[PDB]
Amino acid sequence: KSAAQTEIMLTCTDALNRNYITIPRGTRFLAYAKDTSVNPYNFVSREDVIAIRDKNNQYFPRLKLAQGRIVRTEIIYDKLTPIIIYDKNIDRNQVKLYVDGAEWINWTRKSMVHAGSTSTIYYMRETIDGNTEFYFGEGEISVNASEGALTANYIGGLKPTQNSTIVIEYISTNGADANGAVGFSYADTLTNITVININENPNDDPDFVGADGGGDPEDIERIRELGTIKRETQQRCVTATDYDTFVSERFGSIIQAVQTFTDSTKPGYAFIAAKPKSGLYLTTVQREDIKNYLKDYNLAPITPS
Amino acid sequence: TYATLPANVYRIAEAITCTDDYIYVVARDKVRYIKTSNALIDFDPLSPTYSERLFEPDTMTITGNPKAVCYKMDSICDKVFALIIGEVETLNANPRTSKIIDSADKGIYVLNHDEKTWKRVFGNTEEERRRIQPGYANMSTDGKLVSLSSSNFKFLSDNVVNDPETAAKYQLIGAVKYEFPREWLADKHYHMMAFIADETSDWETFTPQPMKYYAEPFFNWSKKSNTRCWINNSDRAVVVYADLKYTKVIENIPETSPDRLVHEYWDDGDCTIVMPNVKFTGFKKYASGMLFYKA
Amino acid sequence: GIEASYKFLFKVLYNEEVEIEIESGAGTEYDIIVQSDSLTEDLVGQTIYTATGRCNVTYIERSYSNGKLQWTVTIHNLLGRLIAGQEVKAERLPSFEGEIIRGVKGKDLLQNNIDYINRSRSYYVMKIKSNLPSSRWKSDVIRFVHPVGFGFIAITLLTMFINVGLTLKHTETIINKYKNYKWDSGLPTEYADRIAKLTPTGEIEHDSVTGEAIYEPGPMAGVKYPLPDDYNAENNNSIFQGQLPSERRKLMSPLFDASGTTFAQFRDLVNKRLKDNIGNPRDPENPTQVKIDE
Amino acid sequence: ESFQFSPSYVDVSSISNFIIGENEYHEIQGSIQQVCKDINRVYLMESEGILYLFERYQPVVKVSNDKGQTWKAVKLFNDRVGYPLSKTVYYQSANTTY
Amino acid sequence: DSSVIYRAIVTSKFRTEKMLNFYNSIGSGPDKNTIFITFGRSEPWSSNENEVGFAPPYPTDSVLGVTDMWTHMMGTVKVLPSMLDAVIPRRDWGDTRYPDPYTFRINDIVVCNSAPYNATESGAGWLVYRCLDVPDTGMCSIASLTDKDECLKLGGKWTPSARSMTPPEGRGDAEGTIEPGDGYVWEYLFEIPPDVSINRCTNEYIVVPWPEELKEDPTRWGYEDNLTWQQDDFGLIYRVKANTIRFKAYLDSVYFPEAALPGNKGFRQISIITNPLEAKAHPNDPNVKAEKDYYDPEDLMRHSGEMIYMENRPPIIMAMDQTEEINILFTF
Amino acid sequence: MNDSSVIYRAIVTSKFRTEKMLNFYNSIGSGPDKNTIFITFGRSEPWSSNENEVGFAPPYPTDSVLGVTDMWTHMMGTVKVLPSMLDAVIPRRDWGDTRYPDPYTFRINDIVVCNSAPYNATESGAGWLVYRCLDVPDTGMCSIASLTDKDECLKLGGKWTPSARSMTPPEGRGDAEGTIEPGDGYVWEYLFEIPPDVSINRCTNEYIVVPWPEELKEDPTRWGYEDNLTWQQDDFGLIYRVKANTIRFKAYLDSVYFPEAALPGNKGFRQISIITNPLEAKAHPNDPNVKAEKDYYDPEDLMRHSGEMIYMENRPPIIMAMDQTEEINILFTF
């Protein structure tokens, strides 16, 4: 179940003139949705903002946003009982599990190998009953006595040490039924803030309604995806037409008309030919930047050109 | 300005202050109000009075200690400080450059104005006062910093307390564990600290903060060009050029005169505005967005 | 098949050990500018070598300076440190003769010779170059990893990880105070011990414990005697205080009236000695001090 | 690279938070030189006018626009200058260096 | 127990000096030790060698364990001071292959600028930063407490619960603060030239310069500019608290007279001996201390010098490729 | 890493522990390269309310600069440790003393001294001869640590308490090559000489001194060699064969060198460090700099925090009254 995102820039002032205002992550924005309901919907922010103070004292936080509540449910880790939160309104996109006293990156889909041993990456899966499991990797940082080296000993993410604290946070949402928007009513009691107005359409976009994600996906649409997994080579380019697939998928907003051709008698290169959608030759810090993001995948010998 | 002194501070000079409205000079803990522009002057034949504007008549002479040998003094916005070391050498008059000793009343001294009297907010106690040493101390100030300077950190009183737990697992009957009061102290050699305090307060009780450049307090502040200079003990001279944004400010000329490329036309309405093709090179951050025109 | 999959493989299956492999692969790139005619493109992908070093060419982009022709070639996976003034001939299309200026130093491999840098040329073979007997993984690198078109040779490296630096525990530090003797000296306050038994530091030891002779207390305690009613030659103030008191507050001073003091050196005060608790067999029995770590 | 722009941004100050900048820095380009015989007594002031150095007494000062690569000696102090008790000599505000 | 008690701990700086003492101890003249690496042990032990696990004979330090060794020694190499180097644990900023990519303890040296995902300056250099502070949020270290400062008193190690956006960008101490944005106050310390990093630095450790190579130029190391209240503070090997040293040599450098044996049958045990005497025909000769470059172990006197380290390992057969590497990283 | 397919075995032996120590002392010397050592003295502050007593103890120092900085604040004076004062030691077991628990015995490899005392004195023109160690225990009667027993179980197991006394444990200088075995079993292996002058000076109730190489190689026959054919085997030197593996240095604190501080009431509260390679005041800061070679520098003139602090300790009172010298012994295994 995917919550409803949006982006709003806000105008706030406060008694203190402090050179940089800051808005904490968790906040409370009350929002009406037309059609389906009457009673409000609770929007909570995401990440945080800084902005500045300029001319007549004003602040312009651009902060992003999402619907639903926020919950912690700390408990404690052990090597046997899996975490397994319960409420099915979780939004598996927005989560920060940190729990270690430090934040770990959500690895849910990066594949694996790109993260070596002891990497802080943690995983998650589905369950047979419909819940979510936060299970971590398997590996330890243990070091010998007479050695002294670090020596990451296993594969996957670093397994949290026993009895170590855990606290996680996810966005529990009321569902896609809140798709829409009305005037956002600021509540979000803070230290010193006065919210003047809110313009829910920054960037001066075209015809606009408060955006969202969908609800739970359908059933039959699930089956056609695994058929599109096996046939899809993920986190690699093994073919001459695979480079043209990844280069054009991401960078197609700038690059256009790519082809890659492998030349015998010069094994180990696989030149690719890319053209800008704007100019003629590829600029530096572009040609360089196209050469990256293919180093994360690549393969083998045979490195790009 | 020119000439010198109320004639009490003649020769025997100590530091400087510009402020904005008018200059400050100090000797033997004295002062002068010399106006930066449009001070009083007359040629009435007393003193050379060459139309070199004479100073304001009076003087403040902070606290009760003559020859108190105030150290370097500096200013930002409208306010000053004038750190004094101590001493006076314990004997009145005499040069202030020899045999400095430790005396009471040492402090930064403020000088919030309109009372012509200086408040002295930093050292109120031997704890804070001892932190200043006759050697190796400076008040130098980058814009909105006023770093002070120090060394000679020592655990004092509450820095050691309690330790019940060490009495456990042992018989010791008593123990003393440090509280590690946090004061940013430099690495390298001659570990240095800083009392830097800024805004948020009205200055007023400096508190320890990280020193950016390692003896930022020893630099000679400058306002025009807003750079700070100093000399490395290796005999090299170091420069800190401060900072800038990349704003070009394209084509700045008043409406008068030719050579202005950007200008606005009109034909039966229908605005047409023309620009040179702004371009620039060298910016070393990989960041992009508008060229972002603004006035 | 992609690099860093090996590093994931050897973790999972063949031993636990780390791996490092280098072919003419992906890697960091360096900038080198070379001047020649005949440098017409498609050299990208070839192997450039000089007398000193060997390398490959990623990107052929031209530079601009008057005279000759100067290209800035993007070079990667360099080994052998090509240097200015070298004649830089390409392996094939031979026809490349040129000169390098503004080179770079990629890699060492001890003595630098175009002959030695090749030895037997690896060409496109790949060096798995991780630990291991090489017969355990060799079956498993093929099948689950590696492309079918590359050479794949195995070589070994060894890492000792000597752990020295344990101990260095400083053991016990021990200091003991002295009452010592200088020609200043002055009035004692009474006396204690100072001799027992015969003349020559009487009855040397008991011979049971050997060492130094026993000491009997002798005259025990009382007033320090008035001193010769002045005791101060100049009535001076000696070291922060007058001579008549202090200036010799020491309870132990040579009188000339006993053989207790001997000569030179110092007398050690054994009543108070800071005693290392844990140590060699000898040890001072019940210890005076103890070292208890945090 | 951050900062999705919008309209409704009114004053530059408001979005001034996102602008490319130099973060400042410090260099050396030192080694100075002595004026008169006193290497300790010299002073240093850098400004728009670049690298003024002062003697304790003698009015002759040396100036370099090359950032210490080469020094040139000149007059223009034409007085005993000063012997302040710490370091600073040049102290300036709103131009008007003195 | 009632007695005077004193609580004392040797400082970590003691180690780095001890490390600096082992270096400089390599030289030609007397009072300068000379270290050799020895391999030997051609004959295989048991038949379970070449299998998995099974362990070797555990080596002993007695006189019997030394005597046989000298009988089996296949070849040796002399360690020159140039091929020895200081090393420290490297944490690449924002690398996902090592724990806590975006978070950092109070003081942890972290290299940045190498590989694209960290950019900062260009012109390479592999910049390094100590990190003097952290954002304050998240529970840390002993018991519970709450706030950073109180967790910094009473010992404690505070882990920031907020990822640190962007690498340290500047050339001088305390590059944080000075702006409403977050981040914390990294402190530049030196630089690593690109040329040395491709050779001298592996991915586990980054070299830190001996207080010698910093002379005959500082600039190459990016140390050319520094606060330096002292005329020099020249050696920074103390600043990093460098606790360890690392050795590297190519097996083409070690000398095997036979030249077909080490390849066919591996050297099963490696040991490093100090101060061997040259071959003496009879005990008619004065004692000389070993010099020049190779020493076929025939020319070494038996038990000639003392041996600090023995290793016993399965066969480790070696190919003749001009690159394979010794390591032997000391932790001093 | 853990549980790897290959498993290797590495001793690190003993000698590395000693040889590493030798390199420490092998440059203490005079010059720019030789990094001399300086000890240092303590704090004047009462350090607490409960200060003088047996229970309780100073707070545990901290290696951080926040603790490095307070010493140079609270420190007075630094005595210097010459190269000659530091010395390498051994626990000094001796046969015949009744004071120490076990009179003779001395199982397997142990160091003995005799001719040092009333009880053990023999053949004395040479003073202490005795650093010789026991090559083999005597025949049987060893009941060792476990169940098994016989002359076997030293190999699979621990050490032998021979249960039989030794007699005539004095010995000659030694047998040619290998050494003497006077009595029943208890073969003795003669280890150097130790003349009397160095004894009464640089030994103590605990431990004992061994010469460094560069002395013995320089001068046999004072420390008494040329009896040893195994000498020419591995050059002179022998700090290794003794397995010294420990170093202590000491310092004389004389209140004369610090007449200030030493007044009626100085309480010398804790803090007593060590340090390395300090520097002079420099006069005015710009100047060249010099290595500090002069004894008992005052705290001022040292360039606060010059050199690096190599050791720390806290001893809560001490005393440090005038005319009473102070002798500090500190013992490291490096």
PDB file of C-alpha atoms in Angstrom, chain A residues 144-216:
ATOM      1  CA  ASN A 144      41.273 -12.480  15.622  1.00  0.00           C
ATOM      2  CA  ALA A 145      43.724 -11.948  18.478  1.00  0.00           C
ATOM      3  CA  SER A 146      47.207 -12.276  16.970  1.00  0.00           C
ATOM      4  CA  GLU A 147      45.982 -10.971  13.596  1.00  0.00           C
ATOM      5  CA  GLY A 148      44.600  -7.472  14.178  1.00  0.00           C
ATOM      6  CA  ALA A 149      42.972  -7.152  10.750  1.00  0.00           C
ATOM      7  CA  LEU A 150      39.277  -6.420  10.262  1.00  0.00           C
ATOM      8  CA  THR A 151      38.524  -9.346   7.921  1.00  0.00           C
ATOM      9  CA  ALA A 152      34.833  -9.228   7.009  1.00  0.00           C
ATOM     10  CA  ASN A 153      33.963 -12.910   7.191  1.00  0.00           C
ATOM     11  CA  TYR A 154      30.742 -13.579   5.257  1.00  0.00           C
ATOM     12  CA  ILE A 155      28.364 -12.527   2.472  1.00  0.00           C
ATOM     13  CA  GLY A 156      25.511 -10.053   2.571  1.00  0.00           C
ATOM     14  CA  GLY A 157      24.746  -7.397   5.119  1.00  0.00           C
ATOM     15  CA  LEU A 158      26.242  -7.099   8.577  1.00  0.00           C
ATOM     16  CA  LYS A 159      24.230  -9.072  11.082  1.00  0.00           C
ATOM     17  CA  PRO A 160      23.256  -6.940  14.096  1.00  0.00           C
ATOM     18  CA  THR A 161      24.918  -8.052  17.307  1.00  0.00           C
ATOM     19  CA  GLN A 162      22.723  -9.868  19.810  1.00  0.00           C
ATOM     20  CA  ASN A 163      20.729  -7.784  22.326  1.00  0.00           C
ATOM     21  CA  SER A 164      21.565  -4.614  20.371  1.00  0.00           C
ATOM     22  CA  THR A 165      18.814  -2.006  20.386  1.00  0.00           C
ATOM     23  CA  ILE A 166      16.374  -1.692  17.500  1.00  0.00           C
ATOM     24  CA  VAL A 167      13.960   1.085  16.623  1.00  0.00           C
ATOM     25  CA  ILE A 168      12.394   1.427  13.167  1.00  0.00           C
ATOM     26  CA  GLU A 169       9.935   3.864  11.629  1.00  0.00           C
ATOM     27  CA  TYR A 170       7.546   3.425   8.711  1.00  0.00           C
ATOM     28  CA  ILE A 171       4.667   5.444   7.283  1.00  0.00           C
ATOM     29  CA  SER A 172       1.298   3.911   8.148  1.00  0.00           C
ATOM     30  CA  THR A 173      -1.207   5.224   5.615  1.00  0.00           C
ATOM     31  CA  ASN A 174      -4.967   5.210   5.149  1.00  0.00           C
ATOM     32  CA  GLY A 175      -4.483   4.116   1.529  1.00  0.00           C
ATOM     33  CA  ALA A 176      -4.893   5.612  -1.913  1.00  0.00           C
ATOM     34  CA  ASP A 177      -8.468   6.603  -1.006  1.00  0.00           C
ATOM     35  CA  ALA A 178      -7.019   9.982   0.034  1.00  0.00           C
ATOM     36  CA  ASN A 179      -5.978  10.777  -3.550  1.00  0.00           C
ATOM     37  CA  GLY A 180      -6.763  14.436  -4.020  1.00  0.00           C
ATOM     38  CA  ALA A 181      -6.196  17.577  -1.995  1.00  0.00           C
ATOM     39  CA  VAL A 182      -7.675  20.706  -0.450  1.00  0.00           C
ATOM     40  CA  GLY A 183      -6.160  23.585   1.472  1.00  0.00           C
ATOM     41  CA  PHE A 184      -3.556  22.090   3.785  1.00  0.00           C
ATOM     42  CA  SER A 185      -4.228  23.071   7.389  1.00  0.00           C
ATOM     43  CA  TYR A 186      -0.978  23.435   9.304  1.00  0.00           C
ATOM     44  CA  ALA A 187      -1.052  22.096  12.834  1.00  0.00           C
ATOM     45  CA  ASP A 188       2.409  20.688  13.602  1.00  0.00           C
ATOM     46  CA  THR A 189       3.121  22.445  16.901  1.00  0.00           C
ATOM     47  CA  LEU A 190       6.776  23.495  16.933  1.00  0.00           C
ATOM     48  CA  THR A 191       9.053  25.665  19.050  1.00  0.00           C
ATOM     49  CA  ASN A 192       8.687  29.017  17.279  1.00  0.00           C
ATOM     50  CA  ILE A 193       6.851  28.922  13.928  1.00  0.00           C
ATOM     51  CA  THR A 194       4.062  30.995  12.388  1.00  0.00           C
ATOM     52  CA  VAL A 195       2.772  29.562   9.103  1.00  0.00           C
ATOM     53  CA  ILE A 196       1.340  32.356   6.954  1.00  0.00           C
ATOM     54  CA  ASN A 197       0.117  30.522   3.857  1.00  0.00           C
ATOM     55  CA  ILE A 198       0.741  27.386   1.809  1.00  0.00           C
ATOM     56  CA  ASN A 199       0.770  27.092  -1.986  1.00  0.00           C
ATOM     57  CA  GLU A 200       0.233  23.425  -2.791  1.00  0.00           C
ATOM     58  CA  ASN A 201       1.344  23.826  -6.432  1.00  0.00           C
ATOM     59  CA  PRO A 202       4.984  24.950  -6.434  1.00  0.00           C
ATOM     60  CA  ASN A 203       6.984  25.121  -9.683  1.00  0.00           C
ATOM     61  CA  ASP A 204       3.775  26.495 -11.263  1.00  0.00           C
ATOM     62  CA  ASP A 205       2.847  23.110 -12.680  1.00  0.00           C
ATOM     63  CA  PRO A 206       0.178  22.361 -15.308  1.00  0.00           C
ATOM     64  CA  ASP A 207      -3.281  21.084 -14.342  1.00  0.00           C
ATOM     65  CA  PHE A 208      -2.770  19.784 -10.849  1.00  0.00           C
ATOM     66  CA  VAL A 209      -4.368  17.665  -8.142  1.00  0.00           C
ATOM     67  CA  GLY A 210      -2.706  16.368  -4.983  1.00  0.00           C
ATOM     68  CA  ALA A 211      -0.765  13.357  -6.222  1.00  0.00           C
ATOM     69  CA  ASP A 212      -0.581   9.883  -4.692  1.00  0.00           C
ATOM     70  CA  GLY A 213       0.486   6.320  -5.129  1.00  0.00           C
ATOM     71  CA  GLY A 214      -1.929   3.499  -5.823  1.00  0.00           C
ATOM     72  CA  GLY A 215      -3.368   1.053  -3.351  1.00  0.00           C
ATOM     73  CA  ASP A 216      -2.447  -2.585  -3.092  1.00  0.00           C
TER      74      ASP A 216
END
